[PDB]
Amino acid sequence: AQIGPVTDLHITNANISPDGFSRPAVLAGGTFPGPTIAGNTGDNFQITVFNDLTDPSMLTDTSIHWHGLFQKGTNWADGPAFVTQCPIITGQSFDYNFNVPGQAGTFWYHSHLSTQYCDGLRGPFVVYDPNDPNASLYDVDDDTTIITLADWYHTLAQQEPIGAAITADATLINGLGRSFTNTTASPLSVITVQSGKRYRMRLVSISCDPNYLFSIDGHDMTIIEVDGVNSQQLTVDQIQIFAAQRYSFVLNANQPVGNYWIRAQPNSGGQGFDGGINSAILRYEGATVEDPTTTAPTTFSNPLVETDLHPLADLGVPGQPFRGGADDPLVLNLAFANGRFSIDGVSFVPPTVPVLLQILSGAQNAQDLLPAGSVISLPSNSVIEVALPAGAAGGPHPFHLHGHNFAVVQSANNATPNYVNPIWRDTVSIGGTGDNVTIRFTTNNPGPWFLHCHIDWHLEAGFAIVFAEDIPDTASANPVPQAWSDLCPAYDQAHNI
Numbered sequence: 001a002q003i004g005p006v007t008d009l010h011i012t013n014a015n016i017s018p019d020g021f022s023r024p025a026v027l028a029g030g031t032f033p034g035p036t037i038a039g040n041t042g043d044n045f046q047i048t049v050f051n052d053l054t055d056p057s058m059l060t061d062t063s064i065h066w067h068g069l070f071q072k073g074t075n076w077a078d079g080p081a082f083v084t085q086c087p088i089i090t091g092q093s094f095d096y097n098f099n100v101p102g103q104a105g106t107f108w109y110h111s112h113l114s115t116q117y118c119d120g121l122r123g124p125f126v127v128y129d130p131n132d133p134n135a136s137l138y139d140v141d142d143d144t145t146i147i148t149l150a151d152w153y154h155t156l157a158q159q160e161p162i163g164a165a166i167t168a169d170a171t172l173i174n175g176l177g178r179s180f181t182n183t184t185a186s187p188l189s190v191i192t193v194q195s196g197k198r199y200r201m202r203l204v205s206i207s208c209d210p211n212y213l214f215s216i217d218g219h220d221m222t223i224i225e226v227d228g229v230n231s232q233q234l235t236v237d238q239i240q241i242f243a244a245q246r247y248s249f250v251l252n253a254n255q256p257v258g259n260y261w262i263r264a265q266p267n268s269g270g271q272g273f274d275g276g277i278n279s280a281i282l283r284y285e286g287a288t289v290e291d292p293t294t295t296a297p298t299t300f301s302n303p304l305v306e307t308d309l310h311p312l313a314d315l316g317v318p319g320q321p322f323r324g325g326a327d328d329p330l331v332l333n334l335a336f337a338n339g340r341f342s343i344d345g346v347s348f349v350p351p352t353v354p355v356l357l358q359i360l361s362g363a364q365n366a367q368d369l370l371p372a373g374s375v376i377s378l379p380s381n382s383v384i385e386v387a388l389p390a391g392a393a394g395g396p397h398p399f400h401l402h403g404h405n406f407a408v409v410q411s412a413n414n415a416t417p418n419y420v421n422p423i424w425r426d427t428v429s430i431g432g433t434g435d436n437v438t439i440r441f442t443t444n445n446p447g448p449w450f451l452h453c454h455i456d457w458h459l460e461a462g463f464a465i466v467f468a469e470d471i472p473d474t475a476s477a478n479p480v481p482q483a484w485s486d487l488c489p490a491y492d493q494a495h496n497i
């Protein structure tokens with residue numbers, strides 16, 4: 001069952017074997033992925049997170065981010081450690097109490113301390129719309145239509161050796177999959193459909209790193225939502241989904257009753273499907289319980305291309321229809337060298353005092369804020385443009401902005417901007433060498449909002465900045481509860497800081 005919008009959520013250590021290999025993990029709700037947290041648009045979520053972690057090899061502190069939720073007036077509940085809070089220490093709990101006005105769609109939640117979400121603290125977060133404009137396009141939309149794509153590692157995240165390449169050991173679809181090496185015939189996930197019905201499949205990348213080429217043999221997929229933003233219908237036969245992105249698509253169960261492979265090919269790790277790696281099963285009711293015998297095409301006919309997506313609503317693009325046509329036009333210099341990423345020459349290292357607390361304590365320009373050179377102020381009620389030119393090693397990098405979604409004025413692999421009707425989303429691939437992926441948004445949400453690559457290994461290696469949006473109004477806009485005020489003293493005492 002789904003939990004929420006008011007729920008406890010316990011964070012524990014446990015052994016799991018999602019690909020047949022046992023390792024310890026950091027889990028929400030006792031499972032990988034964690035339980036779906038759900039409610040309706042506009043609801044008050046009160047998620048009391050109980051940190052019960054005891055194994056230091058995966059960190060005993062935690063903090064949880066609710067990915068894609070804007071947190072307007074509740075920046076303190078956003079979750080990124082040392083940006084909006086100190087971590088919750090073991091044996092303590094913290095109530096993330098926030099509202100979701102004006103949002104409805106497919107989201108997720110994850111640890112936002114170090115690389116801890118890779119160790120298992122990841123799960124779906126759905127905000128249903130009772131008056132969804134896409135409601136008539138499908139029959140079924142429930143916990144059984146959520147599809148998570150995850151990378152899974154045999155080596156613990158804190159134990160990945162310095163200087164060696166990090167790749168995953170399995171792709172997990174709905175928590176199950178097979179290992180790329182020493183493959184065993186462990187159970188595959190089954191997604192069940194009834195012939196003739198239409199399903200809102202909510203595809204969630206909970207990846208720490210790889211992008212996936214997602215497809216379903218014999219079927220096509222009609223996209224209706226992108227990162228929480230309703231889209232015009234776009235029929236595709238393959239979706240390249242980057243870390244932290246979401247799509248909803250209509251699946252029409254219009255093929256013969258049978259078994260069909262679900263495929264999720266990562267860009268690193270095991271290539272292909274030998275032994276049933278990178279696979280799950282779409283099973284029609286009344287089909288034999290057996291593996292599919294279908295194949296993929298050699299070449300997909302209608303892959304998703306981001307510039308083909310358009311909002312369902314008339315969202316437009318803020319600002320003026322040319323490069324630099326914004327109140328605050330930025331161009332970030334995104335680089336990598338010698339194991340560290342940097343933005344405008346500064347590698348992100350989390351500060352001792354969370355950025356929000358520094359602001360509440362009276363630091364009132366971004367040059368006063370730590371880490372020095374990592375916090376950029378944005379003015380209020382302004383159109384912001386951020387160009388994110390690619391080229392840094394380890395791409396393609398999926399950049400994500402907290403507190404906001406944004407118009408994708410320029411997408412990967414296409415030099416032409418779109419100032420008319422591009423999709424809006426919250427995580428975007430910046431593409432390849434020579435690209436100039438560019439985003440726009442308006443600043444109507446005071447607080448410090450993280451901007452970073454969502455490949456968690458890259459975030460850990462410094463690929464981030466903080467946008468201190470409307471510093472002057474941050475304190476008045478974001479009243480903080482006593483429990484939040486208690487986090488830093490508790491954390492610093494526990495850690496002898």
Ligand SMILES: *[C@@H]1O[C@H](CO)[C@@H](O[C@@H]2O[C@H](CO)[C@@H](O)[C@H](O)[C@H]2NC(C)=O)[C@H](O)[C@H]1NC(C)=O
Pocket residue numbers: 323324329330331387389434435436438
């Ligand atoms: C990406 O687009 C930005 C603008 O959004 C470009 O920025 C300009 O860069 C030149 C030097 O390269 C400066 O003279 C301008 O002041 C910048 N702003 C403008 C023209 O609006 C940037 O060069 C582009 N990058 C790539 C790699 O194409």
Ligand SMILES: *[C@@H]1O[C@H](CO)[C@@H](O[C@@H]2O[C@H](CO)[C@@H](O)[C@H](O)[C@H]2NC(C)=O)[C@H](O)[C@H]1NC(C)=O
Pocket residue numbers: 305307308414415416417418419
């Ligand atoms: C590259 O991106 C541009 C901009 O998003 C795409 O151009 C649009 O194409 C649609 C469909 O033909 C037209 O209706 C729009 O008028 C175009 N807009 C602009 C600003 O040119 C273009 O299709 C993309 N290229 C590819 C190969 O997909």
Ligand SMILES: [Cl-]
Pocket residue numbers: 066067068069070401402403404426
């Ligand atoms: Cl977010």
Ligand SMILES: [Cu+2]
Pocket residue numbers: 065067068110244454
């Ligand atoms: Cu996220």
Ligand SMILES: [Cu+2]
Pocket residue numbers: 065066067068400401402403
């Ligand atoms: Cu986020």
Ligand SMILES: [Cu+2]
Pocket residue numbers: 394395396397398453454455458459463
């Ligand atoms: Cu990256």
Ligand SMILES: [Cu+2]
Pocket residue numbers: 065080112400402450452
């Ligand atoms: Cu983040």
